[PDB]
């Protein structure tokens, strides 16, 4: 129950964090870089997270 309320008490904190874009991959290259386009936009190199 403590766990639950703690999560909810931290809920309004985590919801303060802004949103996350969606993207469509095309291909990747070396040194953990990936080419992804945004949907009506251009193509970005993105470094992948360690997970």
């Amino acid at each position: 129950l403590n766990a639950k309320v703690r999560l909810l008490r931290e809920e309004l904190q985590l919801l303060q964090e802004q949103g996350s874009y969606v993207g469509e991959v095309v291909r990747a290259m070396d040194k953990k870089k990936v080419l992804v386009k945004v949907h009506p936009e251009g193509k970005f190199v993105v470094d992948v997270d360690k997970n």
């Binding site: 403590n2 766990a3 703690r6 999560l7 931290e10 964090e17």
Partner: protein
């Protein structure tokens, strides 16, 4: 009904504890927020 309600909670132990966030993740989020404060 009361007997079932009592018996529901007797087995499920080993629930560890609460996992709010990670210390590394929280520190990184705070550092990114502070660095983007001018931005």
């Amino acid at each position: 009904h009361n007997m079932s309600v009592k018996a529901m909670r007797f087995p499920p132990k080993s629930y560890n504890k609460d996992l709010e966030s990670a210390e590394e993740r929280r520190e990184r989020e705070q550092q990114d927020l502070e660095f983007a404060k001018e931005m």
